[model samples]
Target: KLEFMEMEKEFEQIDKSGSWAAIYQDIRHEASDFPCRVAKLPKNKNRNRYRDVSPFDHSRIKLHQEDNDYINASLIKMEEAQRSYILTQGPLPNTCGHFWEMVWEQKSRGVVMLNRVMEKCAQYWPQKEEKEMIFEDTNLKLTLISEDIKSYYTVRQLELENLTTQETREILHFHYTTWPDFGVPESPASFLNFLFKVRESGSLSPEHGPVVVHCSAGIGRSGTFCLADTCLLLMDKRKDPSSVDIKKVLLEMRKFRMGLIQTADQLRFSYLAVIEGAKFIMGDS
Candidate 1:
């Protein structure tokens, strides 16, 4: 195992080198090459928030036995970490039913919302007191069970019931509201605390369906969160924390969902979060 000093040195080297520009360019080029046939579908046009951002066919989530089998969502599977995530964009007004259908069809145990309502996104949930909302398009009902509010985030339990078959399942929603768009969180502690809270609930485990993570576009803050969490998992998996390549992992994740780690600053923040999380894993704090 590499010593703590070695991990620290590697983190410093990448932090100061500032050589991620080329990598970002490469990612963009690769995404341009990905086939976005779904975006070309005339019927699916209004369901997307942005016409330019579309899920790749290879990893795109397909609804089971649905007439309009289209949703701006992708399944990102990290084999090393044994974690699977459904990286998706915030639901548009017309696509709310498909959003819930994706969750139910995939049997996702949790939903990690990184953006707030009316912030370049639409409201996609039921009212708390009303308790239930039916997605008219898909005949799906989402019921809010309970919620625990915090200063920076909220933990909510929601039930998804299929109106056709009367089947029901509960899902967890981890909403981090304090994070700014196209930016990083104020500190790694708050982000890490939130990360561990999700881990503590066993929502990220492989036994459950892939956790659905979304921001406005599902590639900026969403990317940052996935990258940091995956890096920490690598650190824990390997005896040498220094062996975990943050850039390499980010590139692999982008294969599943386009434009992960959106900005250079977000990439830099990912390294910071990983470095801090490594300390926690190594018991060095």
Candidate 2:
């Protein structure tokens, strides 16, 4: 019985649902369409990629009008009964951009204010009326590695008139500038410390579990962070569930998350280190 119990715990490490990959990515490409803000209801154009859209601001930028309308129409298409989202951190194409915005409203409707994801830990979830998140705040955690981490993790309220605050804090943790200089993966230490901060800062997980992570398109950086989360979940528990597979995990991530990258190189950030996030969870690198 003791041995079987230990094996059971190890199996618990496995992710049966295969929730660990970049499953949310779909439709909409283009660097200009990187994930920023909660995806707006379409706009004129973006000089700043991280700019957000507002549910309140009905005012449409003339140049961005087509995109805006596209966004609005797509929201109507994409929304589900649960109102949960698989979000990208940057921009989306004109059509589904609004879909992103629509999903973002969950964050808007819930929180009274937007702070660091760690800062919002004490707050209660905003709307029981809309969606039933598996955990509170829908695991909205975003990680950064390069020196540009802060810039990349930029979050804008986007909603103008409604003044709706997001329930999820859009946590941006992990800033490394050692390995190459200016970008992440400077060194193994650079990578580990950034991820540790998220753990230490009380941002990514609590007694709760792993938080949702993303980057510009919910693909490259975003997918890597997500992969780390799944891998860590598996390692921490130490049991392998038959359901866990790297490919299937990424697929779900694209489906629920949106716009994960097609390129493998885009997501191959310190692969060894990220895999070791499990070790970090248990002990040290």
Q: Candidate 2: worst 10 consecutive residues by lDDT?
A: 72-81
All candidates' lDDT scores? 0.84, 0.33
lDDT tens string, model 1, 85-165?
998999888888888989988888899999888658878886574757889888998889988899889999998899999
Error of 2 at 115 (Å): 19
Candidate 2 to truth, TM: 0.40
What TM-score would you give candidate 1 relative to the actual structure? 0.92
> Model 1 — which ten-residue stretch has the worst lDDT?
24-33
- Predicted model with the maximum lDDT: 1
209 in model 1: Cα distance from truth in Å?
A: 1.0
